[PDB]
Symmetry: C2
Subunit: 60 residues, 2 copies
């Protein structure tokens, strides 16, 4: 039900964020994270860093 909906929203709409997923499915963030962890542990979904949100610092 909820898990099968989360995995499917990811197949049809690749690249979404954690909070964009919980909004487009009306699933609480805590519930969605538990299912995302299962889907990662089974290697059915993966995870990429968003360059648009990386932060830059000068080195020492």
């Amino acid at each position: 039900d909820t898990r099968r909906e989360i995995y499917k929203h990811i197949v049809k709409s690749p690249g979404l964020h954690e909070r964009q997923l919980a909004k487009e499915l009306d699933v609480p963030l805590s519930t969605l994270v538990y299912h995302l962890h299962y889907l990662e542990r089974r290697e059915l979904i993966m995870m990429k860093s968003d360059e648009r949100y990386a932060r830059y610092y000068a080195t020492k």
Copy 2:
């Protein structure tokens, strides 16, 4: 070889980093009035020279289905 424009843009970027740490590249571009493509060109260079470092933010990770 590097134009005055390339050197000026590079140094202006590096030291906006020092004066204002932790910004994203779209904020970097709008605050320096530089196109995003050119800014990312200079960020990769400053990172190759280890003058700046790039920290990912995993709160904004993108989710994809495996094949």
